[PDB]
Design a protein around this ligand. Sequence first.
Ligand code: ZN
Length: 147
Amino acid sequence: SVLQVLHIPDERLRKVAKPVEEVNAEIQRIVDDMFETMYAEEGIGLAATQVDIHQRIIVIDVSENRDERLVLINPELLEKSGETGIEEGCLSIPEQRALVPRAEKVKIRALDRDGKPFELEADGLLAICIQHEMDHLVGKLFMDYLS
Ligand SMILES: [Zn+2]
């Protein structure tokens, strides 16, 4: 399915991520669909959030530990190791290029898509790629980040 957030005929009108405290309905698709993406993407670059107001449950499936198709967040964070940026130039008109993001490994004090607060580290090319997504937007280095 992939997370089909919208832009330009949308209302983002410059969207950032609006941290994770609670859950709604769409949230499932952020997890469930970031699985469909985090796994079927790692190529073009989406921008993890942007239709109207936001939240951010991230994902992982048997990725760091001997877990299941679990989740990671962008929450109320605790640790933030290294920085990198991806060579994209994404969202709200994904033209131009840049390395907006700046993350390597990042640990959270978050919440999943149940409404249950979870503290975990998010690592790997995807943690950096889905945050990429929203590090294109909330990690903002770029310029206009074509928003
Ligand atoms: Zn990108």
